[PDB]
Structure 1
Amino acid sequence: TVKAILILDNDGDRLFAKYYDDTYPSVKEQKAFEKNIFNKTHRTDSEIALLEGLTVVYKSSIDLYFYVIGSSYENELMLMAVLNCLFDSLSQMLRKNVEKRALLENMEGLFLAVDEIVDGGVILESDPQQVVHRVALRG
């Protein structure tokens, strides 16, 4: 189970957020959480942390920070598989430039990919090759 997927820009500003349960019901609480996460994280190719009582697996590209968040009890490799599948699906779709400019140019790609990976918090698919194939079929 995934509780959230976030992509923040280099200023910590939300490019994409999806929350799958009621942990952060208001937008003010979500944005505060996003700010806290951002301020407690840094550039990396892949890190796991407990933050805010939750398991956060995350990674950065040149100007984007990608987080996949689960409960404090979750299998953290499952959460990493989501994060890799999302990132690697984008890498294929963005011709290997995973950056704010390219991603904003194909946000539907992004939205459809996340919907192939997670459905209401349930992890449906961790192979990015599968995901990109299905996004191509849907838009």
Structure 2
Amino acid sequence: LYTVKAILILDNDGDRLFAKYYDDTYPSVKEQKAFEKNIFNKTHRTDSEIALLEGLTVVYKSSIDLYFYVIGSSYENELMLMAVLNCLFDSLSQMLRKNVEKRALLENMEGLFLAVDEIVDGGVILESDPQQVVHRVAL
């Protein structure tokens, strides 16, 4: 039981606006931020549903001032990961009552924290239905 390695929603530098680690491989801030900077540097300023970083398929999207991440295994493809990443974007948008930017996330830090935990649970994909997550969470 494992698909998603980690989820990060990063500003346009790779610094932690947010990350919640569905791996046990980053718990300390220094390394959680390093990871975040690492994934953001590869993936950014080339938007696609694919990136390969650290031998893992990284699926990412972007907004005005954020890049949104799911990191998962590379034995899969973008599309499986993408379903998590689409939930992540979508659910935060509907939850916060505003599209994902740094402003929406900061506006409601609580909605963001709770919403992401419903999407991924210890690296298993707990939820992937944006609607379900949003009802499930209370602001």
TM bucket (normalised to shorter chain) is 0.7 to 0.9
Q: CA deviation at 1:123?
A: 0.8
SS at match of 1:3: strand
Range that drifts further, 34-43 or 50-59: 34-43
- Seen in structure 2, the aligned counterparts of structure 1 residues 115 and 26 have a Cα distance that, compared at 3 Å, is closer
Which portions of structure 1, spanning 4 or more consecutive aligned residues, are displaced by more than 4 angstroms? Answer: 43-46
Distance 2:76 2:45 in 1: 23
- CA deviations on 1:71-106 (whole Å, 9 max, x unpaired) are 222343221111001101122124343211121011
Does the aligned pair in 1 maintain the 2:98–2:104 contact within 8 Å?
no
Does the aligned pair in 1 maintain the 2:70–2:81 contact within 8 Å?
yes
Range that drifts further, 39-48 or 57-66: 39-48
- Seen in structure 2, the aligned counterparts of structure 1 residues 25 and 74 have a Cα distance that, compared at 3 Å, is farther
Q: Tell me the TM-score normalized by structure 1.
A: 0.85
Q: CA deviation at 1:22?
A: 3.6
Does the aligned pair in 2 maintain the 1:44–1:59 contact within 8 Å?
no
Gaps of 5+ in 1: none
What aligned pairs does 1:26-65 form with structure 2 within 5 A after superposition? 26-43=28-45, 46-65=48-67
Q: CA deviation at 1:57?
A: 0.3
RMSD over aligned Cα, in angstroms? 2.1
Q: CA deviation at 1:66?
A: 0.5
Give % identity: 100
Q: Tell me the TM-score normalized by structure 2.
A: 0.85
Q: CA deviation at 1:53?
A: 1.2
Distance 1:76 1:45 in 2: 13
Does the aligned pair in 2 maintain the 1:117–1:131 contact within 8 Å?
yes
> How many aligned residue pairs are there?
137
- Seen in structure 2, the aligned counterparts of structure 1 residues 50 and 104 have a Cα distance that, compared at 3 Å, is same
SS at match of 1:57: strand
- Matched with 1:19 is 21
Q: CA deviation at 1:133?
A: 0.8
Distance 2:8 2:79 in 1: 18
Distance 1:44 1:131 in 2: 29
Range that drifts further, 36-45 or 126-135: 36-45
- CA deviations on 1:30-60 (whole Å, 9 max, x unpaired) are 3222222221122566521111111100011
Range that drifts further, 73-82 or 7-16: 73-82
Does the aligned pair in 2 maintain the 1:67–1:83 contact within 8 Å?
yes
